[PDB]
Amino acid sequence: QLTAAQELMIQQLVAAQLQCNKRSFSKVTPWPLGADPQSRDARQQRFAHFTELAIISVQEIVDFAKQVPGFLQLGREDQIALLKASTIEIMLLETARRYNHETECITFLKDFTYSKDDFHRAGLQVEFINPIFEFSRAMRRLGLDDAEYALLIAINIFSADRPNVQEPGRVEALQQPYVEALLSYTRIKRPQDQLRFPRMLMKLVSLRTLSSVHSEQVFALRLQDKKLPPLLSEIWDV
Ligand SMILES: O=C(O)Cc1ccc(COc2cccc(-c3c(Cc4ccccc4)cnc4c(C(F)(F)F)cccc34)c2)cc1
Ligand SMILES: O=C(O)Cc1ccc(COc2cccc(-c3c(Cc4ccccc4)cnc4c(C(F)(F)F)cccc34)c2)cc1
Numbered sequence: 001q002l003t004a005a006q007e008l009m010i011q012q013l014v015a016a017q018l019q020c021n022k023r024s025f026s027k028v029t030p031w032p033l034g035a036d037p038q039s040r041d042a043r044q045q046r047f048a049h050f051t052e053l054a055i056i057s058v059q060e061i062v063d064f065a066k067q068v069p070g071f072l073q074l075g076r077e078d079q080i081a082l083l084k085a086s087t088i089e090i091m092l093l094e095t096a097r098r099y100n101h102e103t104e105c106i107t108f109l110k111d112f113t114y115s116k117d118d119f120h121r122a123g124l125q126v127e128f129i130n131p132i133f134e135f136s137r138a139m140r141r142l143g144l145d146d147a148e149y150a151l152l153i154a155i156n157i158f159s160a161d162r163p164n165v166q167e168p169g170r171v172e173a174l175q176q177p178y179v180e181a182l183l184s185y186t187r188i189k190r191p192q193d194q195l196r197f198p199r200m201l202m203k204l205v206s207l208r209t210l211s212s213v214h215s216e217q218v219f220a221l222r223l224q225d226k227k228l229p230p231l232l233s234e235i236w237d238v
Contacts, residue, residue, distance in 0.1 A: 002188060006181045009069065013150035016067035024060045024109065028052040031112065046122035051229050053108050054091070058235070061090050068154050070174045078166050084235055085162040088214050089207040090153055092132065097149060099136035106136070123226055128217040135206055142199060147185060154178040156204060 002010075031049050035042035065071050065083055072079070098107050107113040119129045144152070158175035160168040186197040218236050221227055228237060 002181075002184050006184055009177065009181055010147050010151070010185065012067075012069060013154060014146050016064055017146065017150045017153075020060050020064045020067065023063065024056055028056065028109075028112075043121070043123055046118075047226065049112075050119075050122050050124075051232060053112070055229070055231060056109070057091050057094065058087055058231075061087055061094075064090075064153070065157055068157060071157065074170060074174070075166060077164075078171065081162055081164045081166075082157055082159070082171070085211075086157050086159065087235060088211050089156055089204075092135065092207060092210055092214075093139075093149065093153060093156070093203075095132065096136040096139035097144075099133075099140055101137065101140050104133075123224075125217055125220055128213055131210060131213055135203075135210060138206075139203065142196065142203075144200070145189075148182065148189075148200065151178055151182040151185065152200060152203070155182065155201075156207070 029045070029049050029052055032042045032045040035045075062083060065079075065086075071082075074082070095106055099105075100107065100113075103113075105113045105115050105118075116129055116133060120126065155175060155178045158171050158178065160171040160175070165171055182200065183197055186200070187194075190196050214236075215238070218228070218238075222237075227233065
């Protein structure tokens with residue numbers, strides 16, 4: 001019982017997500033192969049490889065948001081305020097989406113697959129990596145399809161409570177149709193489990209905390225002179 005209008009909205013979202021991601025292929029610094037043991041330079045090269053993946057992701061996320069129906073109707077100031085806050089959360093959703101529970105690794109851009117050890121080997125701290133993997137496993141147990149991921153991202157974008165939002169009324173009104181679509185879609189997909197929808201919305205709660213956990217990781221780089229490139233530092237370093 002999805003209405004025609006809801007079906008159309010969902011098609012648009014899934015088509016946009018697909019196109020934007022394919023556009024992230026249409027060259028990152030390599031993962032260091034052939035390094036010496038305990039190497040300063042190897043570690044920095046790993047970190048640099050990761051910062052460049054993050055820079056690819058942020059561009060994909062902005063490109064996707066611009067395609068989300070209603071986003072560009074908002075004032076430009078609100079567009080920026082919404083994307084600034086949602087970028088890390090959407091990035092962690094797309095990360096969770098690429099977790100393989102069999103291997104316990106994350107695969108980025110098809111070719112780049114990494115373990116907890118590999119993230120640690122690049123200089124990221126256990127206090128950040130562990131909750132990300134915990135979240136990824138919890139996301140895996142939900143079994144979201146492409147429509148559910150796209151809808152959840154749209155809902156995340158139109159959060160009226162982000163810092164410096166000018167027209168929170170308009171933002172909340174834009175969130176409504178996407179919340180309503182996800183409610184309808186989840187009922188049809190799994191009618192016997194009436195909790196899958198609350199459990200999904202609850203992942204937005206966890207993402208808020210992960211953003212805070214991420215802020216602490218960013219801060220921990222300041223007392224080990226391992227700083228972010230300027231682009232990432234602008235959106236992430238307070
Ligand atoms: O834009 C492009 O064509 C390509 C591109 C894609 C990604 C990035 C880096 O990744 C991000 C992620 C979250 C937001 C922005 C961001 C934008 C970006 C933006 C654009 C349109 C609507 C909304 C947001 C614009 N202006 C910002 C400003 C300000 F002070 F206002 F100048 C401050 C802080 C962030 C921003 C950037 C930079 C470029
Ligand atoms: O694959 C596709 O098709 C699309 C796609 C392409 C790329 C990506 C993201 O790619 C990555 C890969 C490795 C790390 C990050 C990264 C994160 C995010 C993060 C952190 C730990 C583990 C997983 C993810 C957060 N913070 C970082 C910081 C910090 F200092 F903390 F600011 C520094 C450097 C990297 C990071 C990002 C997603 C989707």
